[PDB]
Design a protein around this motif. Structure first.
Motif, PDB file in Angstrom:
ATOM      1  N   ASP B  42       0.828  -1.085  -0.025  1.00 36.39           N
ATOM      2  CA  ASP B  42      -0.004   0.025  -0.051  1.00 36.39           C
ATOM      3  C   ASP B  42       0.846   1.280   0.020  1.00 36.39           C
ATOM      4  O   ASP B  42       2.143   1.007   0.384  1.00 36.39           O
ATOM      5  CB  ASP B  42      -0.697   0.116   1.446  1.00 36.39           C
ATOM      6  CG  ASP B  42      -1.783  -1.144   1.269  1.00 36.39           C
ATOM      7  OD1 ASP B  42      -2.566  -1.407   0.292  1.00 36.39           O
ATOM      8  OD2 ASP B  42      -2.006  -1.888   2.284  1.00 36.39           O
ATOM      9  N   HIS B  43       0.264   2.226  -0.354  1.00 35.70           N
ATOM     10  CA  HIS B  43       0.896   3.374  -0.524  1.00 35.70           C
ATOM     11  C   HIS B  43       1.427   4.131   0.703  1.00 35.70           C
ATOM     12  O   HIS B  43       0.496   4.845   1.324  1.00 35.70           O
ATOM     13  CB  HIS B  43      -0.017   4.670  -1.503  1.00 35.70           C
ATOM     14  CG  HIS B  43      -0.148   4.172  -2.927  1.00 35.70           C
ATOM     15  ND1 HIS B  43       1.006   4.307  -3.698  1.00 35.70           N
ATOM     16  CD2 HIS B  43      -1.192   3.686  -3.595  1.00 35.70           C
ATOM     17  CE1 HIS B  43       0.607   3.886  -5.072  1.00 35.70           C
ATOM     18  NE2 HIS B  43      -0.607   3.564  -5.091  1.00 35.70           N
ATOM     19  N   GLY B  44       2.675   4.111   1.056  1.00 39.55           N
ATOM     20  CA  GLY B  44       3.143   4.847   2.346  1.00 39.55           C
ATOM     21  C   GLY B  44       2.581   4.809   3.405  1.00 39.55           C
ATOM     22  O   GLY B  44       1.966   5.642   4.300  1.00 39.55           O
ATOM     23  N   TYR B  67       5.334  -2.961   1.191  1.00 41.05           N
ATOM     24  CA  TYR B  67       5.187  -1.372   1.560  1.00 41.05           C
ATOM     25  C   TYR B  67       5.922  -0.647   0.170  1.00 41.05           C
ATOM     26  O   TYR B  67       6.886  -0.631   0.160  1.00 41.05           O
ATOM     27  CB  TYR B  67       5.986  -1.028   2.698  1.00 41.05           C
ATOM     28  CG  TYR B  67       6.104   0.520   3.049  1.00 41.05           C
ATOM     29  CD1 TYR B  67       4.819   0.859   3.790  1.00 41.05           C
ATOM     30  CD2 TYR B  67       7.240   1.079   2.930  1.00 41.05           C
ATOM     31  CE1 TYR B  67       5.167   2.087   4.176  1.00 41.05           C
ATOM     32  CE2 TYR B  67       7.441   2.514   3.236  1.00 41.05           C
ATOM     33  CZ  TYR B  67       6.348   3.003   3.941  1.00 41.05           C
ATOM     34  OH  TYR B  67       6.341   4.392   4.436  1.00 41.05           O
ATOM     35  N   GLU B  68       4.901  -0.067  -0.251  1.00 47.55           N
ATOM     36  CA  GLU B  68       5.214   0.908  -1.710  1.00 47.55           C
ATOM     37  C   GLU B  68       5.728   2.288  -1.159  1.00 47.55           C
ATOM     38  O   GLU B  68       4.830   3.304  -1.073  1.00 47.55           O
ATOM     39  CB  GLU B  68       4.259   1.080  -2.649  1.00 47.55           C
ATOM     40  CG  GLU B  68       4.385   1.890  -3.911  1.00 47.55           C
ATOM     41  CD  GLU B  68       3.690   1.570  -4.936  1.00 47.55           C
ATOM     42  OE1 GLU B  68       2.644   0.595  -5.269  1.00 47.55           O
ATOM     43  OE2 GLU B  68       4.015   2.307  -6.278  1.00 47.55           O
ATOM     44  N   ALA B  69       7.047   2.578  -0.884  1.00 50.45           N
ATOM     45  CA  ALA B  69       7.450   3.555  -0.019  1.00 50.45           C
ATOM     46  C   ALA B  69       7.334   4.691  -1.167  1.00 50.45           C
ATOM     47  O   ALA B  69       7.978   4.424  -2.383  1.00 50.45           O
ATOM     48  CB  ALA B  69       8.713   3.395   0.487  1.00 50.45           C
ATOM     49  N   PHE B  82       9.410   9.664  -5.194  1.00 49.56           N
ATOM     50  CA  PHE B  82       9.291   8.573  -5.949  1.00 49.56           C
ATOM     51  C   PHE B  82       8.768   7.207  -5.242  1.00 49.56           C
ATOM     52  O   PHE B  82       9.180   6.991  -3.968  1.00 49.56           O
ATOM     53  CB  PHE B  82      10.903   8.434  -6.385  1.00 49.56           C
ATOM     54  CG  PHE B  82      11.312   9.330  -7.438  1.00 49.56           C
ATOM     55  CD1 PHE B  82      12.104  10.264  -7.157  1.00 49.56           C
ATOM     56  CD2 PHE B  82      11.106   9.108  -8.893  1.00 49.56           C
ATOM     57  CE1 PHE B  82      12.648  11.083  -8.204  1.00 49.56           C
ATOM     58  CE2 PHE B  82      11.441   9.711 -10.005  1.00 49.56           C
ATOM     59  CZ  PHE B  82      12.253  10.833  -9.640  1.00 49.56           C
ATOM     60  N   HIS B  83       8.325   6.499  -6.284  1.00 46.40           N
ATOM     61  CA  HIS B  83       7.860   5.210  -5.745  1.00 46.40           C
ATOM     62  C   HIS B  83       8.982   4.153  -5.506  1.00 46.40           C
ATOM     63  O   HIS B  83       9.706   4.248  -6.326  1.00 46.40           O
ATOM     64  CB  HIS B  83       6.783   4.710  -6.530  1.00 46.40           C
ATOM     65  CG  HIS B  83       5.328   5.415  -6.715  1.00 46.40           C
ATOM     66  ND1 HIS B  83       4.230   4.925  -6.456  1.00 46.40           N
ATOM     67  CD2 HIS B  83       5.194   6.777  -6.763  1.00 46.40           C
ATOM     68  CE1 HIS B  83       3.371   6.057  -6.522  1.00 46.40           C
ATOM     69  NE2 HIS B  83       3.900   7.273  -6.551  1.00 46.40           N
ATOM     70  N   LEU B  84       8.645   3.226  -4.899  1.00 44.71           N
ATOM     71  CA  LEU B  84       9.547   1.965  -4.381  1.00 44.71           C
ATOM     72  C   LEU B  84       8.896   0.916  -3.841  1.00 44.71           C
ATOM     73  O   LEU B  84       8.558   1.234  -2.701  1.00 44.71           O
ATOM     74  CB  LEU B  84      10.760   2.571  -3.691  1.00 44.71           C
ATOM     75  CG  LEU B  84      12.130   1.447  -3.577  1.00 44.71           C
ATOM     76  CD1 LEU B  84      12.369   1.155  -5.110  1.00 44.71           C
ATOM     77  CD2 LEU B  84      12.992   2.257  -3.069  1.00 44.71           C
ATOM     78  N   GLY B 132      10.067  -1.087  -9.315  1.00 43.05           N
ATOM     79  CA  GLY B 132       9.081  -0.108  -8.857  1.00 43.05           C
ATOM     80  C   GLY B 132       8.290   0.145 -10.305  1.00 43.05           C
ATOM     81  O   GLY B 132       8.786  -0.216 -11.239  1.00 43.05           O
ATOM     82  N   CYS B 133       7.076   0.782 -10.240  1.00 44.28           N
ATOM     83  CA  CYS B 133       6.186   1.231 -11.354  1.00 44.28           C
ATOM     84  C   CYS B 133       6.860   2.290 -12.086  1.00 44.28           C
ATOM     85  O   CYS B 133       7.990   2.768 -12.154  1.00 44.28           O
ATOM     86  CB  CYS B 133       4.923   1.592 -10.927  1.00 44.28           C
ATOM     87  SG  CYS B 133       4.746   3.046  -9.666  1.00 44.28           S
ATOM     88  N   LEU B 134       6.043   2.858 -12.949  1.00 42.60           N
ATOM     89  CA  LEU B 134       6.496   4.095 -13.834  1.00 42.60           C
ATOM     90  C   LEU B 134       6.735   5.206 -12.834  1.00 42.60           C
ATOM     91  O   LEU B 134       7.579   6.056 -13.345  1.00 42.60           O
ATOM     92  CB  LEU B 134       5.549   4.513 -14.803  1.00 42.60           C
ATOM     93  CG  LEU B 134       5.091   3.629 -15.711  1.00 42.60           C
ATOM     94  CD1 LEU B 134       3.937   4.110 -16.516  1.00 42.60           C
ATOM     95  CD2 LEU B 134       6.286   3.649 -16.943  1.00 42.60           C
TER      96      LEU B 134
HETATM   97 ZN   LIG Z   1       3.255   3.091  -7.914  1.00 43.96          ZN
END
Ligand SMILES: [Zn+2]
Lengths: 102, 192
Positions: B42-44, B67-69, B82-84, B132-134
């Protein structure tokens, strides 16, 4: 003046499409119609859609140009080019599209 | 020939998450009977971690606490991000995800809860990272035509995680993913 071979060694597979158009103007894509003809033949594109493809280059939209790049390569591979030239052809077309005259 | 989602968002992603915790696990269960696995990323935040764990295990599915940091551009004190994707390897990794989450809100909160590659390095023990994503770092540098930065950033992450780092490849109907996944395939192949 008859003092340079107008060769297409950068795009050997695309040569047979490039010559009939660009031999009239010695290899330099000067006109808008030549970029549309290249686009239509090399990428299997519609001539009417090649008119749209010129406007997209003129507008130079941020990421919408990558939709056409993908479209160009898909058709390009189906015609002849090995998808190493098609991307670098798009680099040429977009570059000379800015000063392309009617 | 089977599959297991490692990047999935649940209802606990408060802004953009629409997948409920119950019906998600049964879909994963009904699709893949043989050793089902699912990762909550999940997002942060790490809200559903306990509820996801005890409901997943209640359905016979193996939970993976992810965990999508949101990763800061430079430092977390800077006042974008940025996503990770981060995945818990073992219980040490779970404790490290709990800390990175906590420091995101307590210390590096600007718009979202953000973290740093400094503190990621501090709490890297037991974390499997993905590219990670775009919206992530390396894929974004590829879109900017800055391959030197992408690779430089890839080397930095490889100094942190080592052999736990992976190249995340995801494909929808998007032309940006073709350029990224192509350049990621080279990077994937170059660095073992
Ligand atoms: Zn993402």
């Amino acid at each position: 003046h008859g003092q340079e071979p107008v060769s297409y060694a950068e795009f050997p597979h695309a040569e047979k499409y490039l010559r009939p158009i660009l031999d009239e103007t010695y290899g330099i894509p000067v006109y808008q119609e030549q970029i549309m003809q290249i686009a239509s033949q090399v990428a299997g594109y519609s001539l009417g859609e090649a008119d749209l493809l010129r406007r997209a280059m003129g507008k130079k939209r941020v990421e919408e140009m990558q939709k056409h790049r993908e479209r160009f390569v898909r058709g390009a591979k189906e015609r002849g080019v090995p998808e190493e030239e098609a991307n670098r052809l798009f680099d040429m077309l977009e570059a000379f599209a800015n000063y392309g005259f009617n | 020939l089977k599959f297991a989602h490692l990047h999935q968002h649940t209802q606990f992603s408060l802004l953009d998450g629409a997948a409920k915790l119950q019906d998600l696990l049964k879909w994963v269960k009904e699709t893949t009977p043989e050793d089902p696995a699912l990762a909550m990323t999940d997002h942060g935040n790490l809200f559903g971690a306990v509820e996801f764990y005890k409901k997943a295990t209640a359905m016979g599915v193996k939970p993976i606490i992810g965990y999508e940091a949101y990763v800061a551009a430079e430092s977390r004190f800077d006042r974008g991000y940025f996503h990770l994707t981060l995945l818990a390897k073992d219980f040490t990794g779970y404790q490290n995800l709990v800390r990175l989450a906590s420091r995101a809100y307590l210390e590096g909160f600007y718009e979202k809860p953000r973290i740093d590659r400094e503190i990621l390095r501090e709490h890297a023990q037991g974390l499997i990272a993905l590219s990670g994503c775009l919206g992530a770092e390396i894929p974004q540098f590829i879109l900017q035509d800055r391959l030197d930065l992408a690779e430089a950033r890839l080397n930095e992450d490889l100094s942190i995680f080592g052999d736990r780092f992976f190249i995340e490849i995801q494909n929808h109907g998007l032309p940006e993913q073709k350029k990224v996944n192509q350049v990621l395939k080279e990077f994937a192949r170059k660095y073992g």
